[PDB]
Amino acid sequence: MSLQHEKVTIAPLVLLSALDHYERTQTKENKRCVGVILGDANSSTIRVTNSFALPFEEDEKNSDVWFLDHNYIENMNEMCKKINAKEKLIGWYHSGPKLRASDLKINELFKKYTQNNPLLLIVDVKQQGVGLPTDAYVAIEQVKDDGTSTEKTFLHLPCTIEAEEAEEIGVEHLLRDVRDQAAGGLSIRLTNQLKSLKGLQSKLKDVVEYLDKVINKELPINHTILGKLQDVFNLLPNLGTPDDDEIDVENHDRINISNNLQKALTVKTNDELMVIYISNLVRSIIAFDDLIENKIQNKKIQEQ
Amino acid sequence: FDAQTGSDREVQRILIELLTQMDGFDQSTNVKVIMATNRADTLDPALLR
Amino acid sequence: HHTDCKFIRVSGAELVQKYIGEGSRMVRELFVMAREHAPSIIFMDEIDSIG
Amino acid sequence: EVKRIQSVPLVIGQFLEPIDQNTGIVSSTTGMSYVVRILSTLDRELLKP
Amino acid sequence: TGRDDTKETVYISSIALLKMLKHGRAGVPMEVMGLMLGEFVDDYTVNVVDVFAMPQSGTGVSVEAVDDVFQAKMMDMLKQTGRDQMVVGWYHSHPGFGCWLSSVDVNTQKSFEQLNSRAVAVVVDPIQSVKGKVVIDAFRLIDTGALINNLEPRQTTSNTGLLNKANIQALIHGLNRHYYSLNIDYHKTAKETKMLMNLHKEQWQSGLKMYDYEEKEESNLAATKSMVKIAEQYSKRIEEEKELTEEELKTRYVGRQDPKKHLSETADETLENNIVSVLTAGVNSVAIK
Amino acid sequence: NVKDLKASQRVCLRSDSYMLHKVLENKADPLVSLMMVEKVPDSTYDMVGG
Fold first, then answer.
1. Which residues of chain C have a CB within 8 Å of the CB of B12?
2. Which residues of E line the annotated binding site?
3. At A251, is the secondary structure helix, strand, or coil?
């Protein structure tokens, strides 16, 4: 037991494997690919190193019916310790994108192969999101506030793709595209800055909609969200304080340095111009010489 | 100067090279090497100077 | 300087080379090396302390 | 791409002399005397010694 | 006659590339074994869809280096999940040596030829690969009867005929008396590419994210001084620089490792950086409040 | 060719079979490396007095 899952690093091996595995069972139409994920666990950083399918069925008539083969999980463990003992079961991927309550009960099962709470790694294989190709959640059991019972629930814990070093080599090989976002030159980051504003703006739009549905359509108040929003209003920049004024002075400080640099280049660019005109000057003379030199050549043929 | 067995000759070699290299060639942009000694009885006869 | 040749010098003992191989035949082969870089002046120095 | 080769891991060697601007001769610390190509836009104004 | 005997285009999927590198690099300084599972179609097309790693062997790669207990069990597990494919080859590493088959590895290929006579043998160096295009080559045997009577070449018809090869060493000797090499072709879809490109939502969130301004001032400070010091270096360049032959000027006034180019790069990095910083700041002001 | 090749001619070679590349008329010797730092003297008859 430990509640340690604060950062989830994903190897790119896991996201492409989940892409294959969905298609090697051929699940569709809110049928799911449930397999295991292995890695290291019982630790502050989880590294999700590997993924495998398991036998699994998903019934659409009742979501409390699914199949799972237990004997498969025991036999796969024996094998993987021989390849690598740094690999152990750390929880399960689920194809998603929809998280359900019956998935808490699948969760309980996986809590009998790993000491830590199992990690349920939602990998969207349908590629509907333009960001989040990983969202990670861990089941924890806690008394929920506002007269509410003890609920078993899936809380979001930070995840990011970071890649192993051994993985990296192949990531470099398969990416031969120009990369619209890669953090390049002036050009690459002006495309980014625009992209970044529409990113945030849409994220902000979900918050508006959510809030409306709480008091219109009576969504359950989840006071965690609402607490975070109090701090949103409390970290708002307020104008007319000496801080904002110093920031406008700093925009001139920075543009000041940009101006000196721009002049310095104007001398390089003019240096290049000067140097071509010298070449062209010479070339006028060389072309003139050919005309004289012909006469000298013609005269020899006649003589000899 | 000794060279009784081979092992007297090795100490000697370090002395030779120190002197020659000391010396200026291109001339020194250093302060010229500093050395310390409990006594000068166990230095060379005249090669320090 | 006035001679107009390659004043190489060579400082100290010449058993000192050992990092590509020993200095117990670069004395000998010095004959050859010097010949190649003609016209060349070898200042093989050794102040002597062999007694 | 070149930046990666430029960076670690590396094996140290020792520049001897050029034999051509774009091929030089070195000796490695593994013990092998190798003729090696010199990547351009390296300081060749200190490489020659 | 008989077999076509033209060397396959091996299409290794993205999953199978990365998996091989994963098992190889953990295992250095040692050899690794493994079986390659795919589908064979056409008369010269093998698609290696997936792989599995055979545990580390105590005698190294050999003809005993597949245990039949692991093998049978491992394929049985793929059959319960529908991921099943057929052994169409085998992979092995030399961890410190580029691609070729030793005497033992060729003899292993003779065994895999029995089971499937279009089999591939892929040699992956895990550490020598920094591109990941390089030091992965596939080999397939050409018939023995073909060797003797000099009907050996027949791999140049029914391919692109663009070949990629290097080394004499073991590699070439291996080639003449046994096998034929052909490059590794990489197959992918745009769903695998799409997954790689994303690296969370913090990829784009960071464009708005602004560093300490303590850092910006420091970077801009260093750069200002740098341009003066390289302007002086450039002043020496134009000290006269009118004597004959361009090449003798390049060496003399340090036109090699040019001070004009050096000034140019220095200016541009700083100019553009401060451009984004002013822009992101201004974005922040108007957007929040 | 064997015609171009003389005895005492320094030659460049490969690692895969040691096949020749180019003749070299340069010579890398432990003597050469000592010369190379020092270079020529600046001395003249009158730098030395008496």
1. 49-50
2. 92, 94, 105
3. helix
Q: What is the rounded distance in angstroms from the CA atom of residue E237 to the CA atom of residue E254?
A: 7
Terminal alpha carbon distance of chain E:
80
Distance, in Å, from the CA atom of E100 to the CA atom of E121, rounded to the nearest integer, reads: 10
Q: How was this structure determined?
A: cryo-EM
CA dist., res. A185 & res. E141, Å (int): 48
Instruction: Report H helices in chain A.
Output: 12-23, 70-83, 103-107, 165-174, 186-216, 223-232, 242-303
Tell me, yes or no, if B9 comes closer than 8 A to chain C by beta carbon: yes
Interchain CB contact of F38 with B (< 8 Å): yes
Judge contact between A92 and A34, C-beta under 8 A: yes
Cβ distance D43 to E254 less than 8 Å, yes or no, reads: no
**Tokens 């992918």, residue located:** E188
Counting Cβ atoms within 10 Å, is residue D2 exposed (0-12), middle (13-18) or buried (19+)? exposed
Contact C15 B13 (CB under 8 A): yes
Distances (CA, A) of A215 to A149, A206, A210, A211, A219: 22, 15, 10, 7, 7
Which residues in chain C touch residue F44, judged by CB atoms under 8 angstroms apart? Answer: 1-2
Is residue C40 within 8 A of residue C34, CB to CB? The reply is: yes
Chain B residues with beta carbon closer than 8 angstroms to that of C45: 20
Dihedral sign of CA atoms A5, A9, A15, A17 in order: negative
Listed residue (C47, C42, C2, C40) closest to C26, CA to CA: C42
State whether residue B25 sits within 8 Å of chain F by CB.
yes
**Interface check D36 vs F, CB under 8 A:** no
Residues 6+ apart with CB under 8 A from E118: E8, E40, E46, E88, E140
- Total residue length of chain B: 49
Radius of gyration of chain A (CA): 32
Q: In Å, how far are D33, E97, E98, F12, F14 from F19, measured between CA atoms?
A: 16, 21, 20, 8, 6
* Local structure of E31: helix, strand or coil: coil
- From the CB coordinates, do chains E and D have 3 or more pairs under 8 Å? yes
D19: nearest CB among F15, F26, F33? F26
CB D35 within 8 A of CB D27: no
On chain C, the residues whose CB falls within 8 A of the CB of F38 are 8-9
